[PDB]
Design an enzyme around this catalytic site. Structure first.
Site, mmCIF file in Angstrom:
data_model
loop_
_atom_site.group_PDB
_atom_site.id
_atom_site.type_symbol
_atom_site.label_atom_id
_atom_site.label_comp_id
_atom_site.label_asym_id
_atom_site.label_seq_id
_atom_site.Cartn_x
_atom_site.Cartn_y
_atom_site.Cartn_z
ATOM 1 N N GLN A 18 21.595 10.388 15.721
ATOM 2 C CA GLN A 18 21.154 11.699 16.200
ATOM 3 C C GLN A 18 19.881 11.523 17.015
ATOM 4 O O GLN A 18 19.658 12.291 17.956
ATOM 5 C CB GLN A 18 20.858 12.655 15.025
ATOM 6 C CG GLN A 18 21.929 12.733 13.929
ATOM 7 C CD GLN A 18 23.119 13.554 14.347
ATOM 8 O OE1 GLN A 18 23.045 14.779 14.480
ATOM 9 N NE2 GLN A 18 24.251 12.895 14.549
ATOM 10 N N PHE A 19 19.083 10.474 16.701
ATOM 11 C CA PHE A 19 17.806 10.273 17.383
ATOM 12 C C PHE A 19 17.673 9.009 18.206
ATOM 13 O O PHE A 19 16.590 8.762 18.741
ATOM 14 C CB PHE A 19 16.633 10.381 16.383
ATOM 15 C CG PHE A 19 16.689 11.617 15.507
ATOM 16 C CD1 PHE A 19 16.664 12.886 16.069
ATOM 17 C CD2 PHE A 19 16.864 11.505 14.135
ATOM 18 C CE1 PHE A 19 16.777 14.031 15.265
ATOM 19 C CE2 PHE A 19 16.960 12.648 13.330
ATOM 20 C CZ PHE A 19 16.919 13.899 13.905
ATOM 21 N N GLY A 20 18.740 8.220 18.297
ATOM 22 C CA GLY A 20 18.666 7.009 19.092
ATOM 23 C C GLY A 20 19.851 6.096 18.892
ATOM 24 O O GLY A 20 20.558 6.139 17.886
ATOM 25 N N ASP A 127 17.518 11.248 1.135
ATOM 26 C CA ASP A 127 18.752 11.568 1.858
ATOM 27 C C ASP A 127 19.817 10.514 1.547
ATOM 28 O O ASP A 127 20.479 10.000 2.458
ATOM 29 C CB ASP A 127 18.468 11.635 3.375
ATOM 30 C CG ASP A 127 19.619 12.165 4.217
ATOM 31 O OD1 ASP A 127 20.515 12.827 3.653
ATOM 32 O OD2 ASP A 127 19.635 11.889 5.429
#
Ligand SMILES: *CCC(=O)N1CCC[C@@H](n2nc(-c3cccc(C(=O)Nc4ccc(C(C)C)cc4)c3)c3c(N)ncnc32)C1
Length: 263
Positions: A18-20, A127
């Site tokens: 999602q971020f890289g 998580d």
């Protein structure tokens, strides 16, 4: 803990985040590695850099290791131990019908051992899910991404009411108050056990996040997977007790699950 850009080579892509993007590459005089490039704004980079040396000391054979950070130029890179067989979620889904319950229990035991080490070190994962458990050599499962949500800047992922918040793995005190503890990680580990014994099914697949909150709060629990014995399902249910105090510690789960596996 600082890795220079000249010490890394990118070979090919592993997959997206999602971020890289994550690449397969080499790290000079060390080993083959997984390299994550992080987009600007996704991470509190200064907080992470402050905590990098600390995270790197959490060295356990059942934890995916952080090897260092390449921060000379944007995007910054994080360098990790390469896990040859990838995410446990896809590993189970693509191989449904292959694994015996003893193997599925062994996967849960590898995760539990890594989590017992974090619990003893007073480190909360926050998580835990099959998507961040990775498969390595001799089918070992290792836990990754412990504590990483502390650095995510997108409130849709971190706020208990955010659209991307992992409500399906969250204990009630986490979905209600973000009250993280090793006992909230135990709740997530019970969901992970369900993902493993169901051979990678998605928990509460036809429920929205708001419906999962109401269902859990009113006593609904995930059904028993066909491959889980009644004793394994009893342990899953202990992880899903409403009060964190009534949930077993990872040190207790590791003995209970090992007793079943070693019997
Ligand atoms: C299911 C497909 C699969 O196998 N995946 C998804 C694509 C990437 C694959 N992969 N990721 C890692 C890995 C391990 C540890 C940590 C990271 C990582 O990038 N963590 C991270 C989390 C959060 C932030 C934010 C911005 C704060 C930043 C970084 C990635 C792999 C390894 N080590 N080996 C193989 N494949 C891996 C998994």
């Amino acid at each position: 803990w600082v890795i220079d850009p000249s010490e890394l080579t990118f070979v090919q892509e592993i997959g997206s985040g999602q971020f890289g993007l994550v690449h397969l590459g080499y790290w000079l005089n060390k080993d083959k590695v997984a390299i994550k490039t992080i987009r600007e704004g996704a991470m509190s980079e200064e907080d992470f850099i402050e905590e990098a040396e600390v995270m790197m000391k959490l060295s356990h054979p059942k934890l995916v290791q952080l090897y260092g950070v390449c921060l000379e130029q944007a995007p910054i890179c994080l360098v990790f131990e390469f896990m040859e067989h990838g995410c446990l979620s896809d590993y189970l889904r693509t191989q449904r019908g292959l694994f015996a319950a003893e193997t599925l229990l062994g996967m849960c035991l590898d995760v539990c051992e890594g989590m017992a080490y974090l619990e003893e070190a007073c480190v909360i994962h926050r998580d835990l899910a099959a998507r961040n458990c990775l498969v390595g050599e001799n089918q070992v499962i290792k836990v990754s991404d412990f504590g990483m949500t502390r650095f995510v800047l997108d409130d849709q992922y971190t706020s208990s009411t955010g659209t991307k918040f992992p409500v399906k793995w969250a204990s009630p005190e986490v979905f209600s108050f973000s009250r993280y503890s090793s006992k909230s990680d135990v709740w997530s580990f019970g969901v992970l056990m369900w993902e493993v014994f169901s051979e990678g099914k998605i928990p509460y697949e036809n429920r929205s996040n708001s419906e999962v909150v109401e269902d859990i709060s009113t006593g609904f629990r995930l059904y028993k997977p066909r491959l889980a014995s009644t004793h394994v399902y009893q342990i899953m249910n202990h992880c899903w007790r409403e009060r964190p105090e009534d949930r077993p510690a990872f040190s207790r789960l590791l003995r209970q699950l090992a007793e079943i596996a070693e019997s």
